């Protein structure tokens, strides 16, 4: 029975282990969408400065 429990624990840990991996594997992917989007906004800010320096159009 000891064996049993120990084995289960190991498997359970592996379960949690994989449950952990996928989790972060998701979070970075989502983060990958965020950062790119952030970059887009950064570009906009830069351009918002450009139009802000064109006095006649501004």
């Amino acid at each position: 029975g000891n064996f049993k429990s120990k084995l289960k624990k190991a498997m359970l840990s592996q379960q949690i282990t994989k449950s952990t991996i996928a989790n972060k594997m998701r979070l970075k992917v989502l983060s990958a969408r965020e950062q790119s989007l952030d970059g887009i906004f950064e570009e906009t800010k830069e351009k918002l400065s450009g139009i802000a320096n064109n006095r006649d159009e501004y």
Binding site: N2, F3, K6, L7, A10
Partner: peptide, 29 residues
């Protein structure tokens, strides 16, 4: 009468020592 061996039959110790060694397969996995 060899009834003393009846007690000596209690070990028989390696019968479970080998079992524990095999159960070490869980630690190996």
């Amino acid at each position: 009468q060899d009834k003393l061996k009846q007690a000596k039959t209690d070990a028989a110790k390696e019968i479970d020592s080998y079992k524990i060694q095999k159960d070490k397969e869980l630690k190996e996995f």
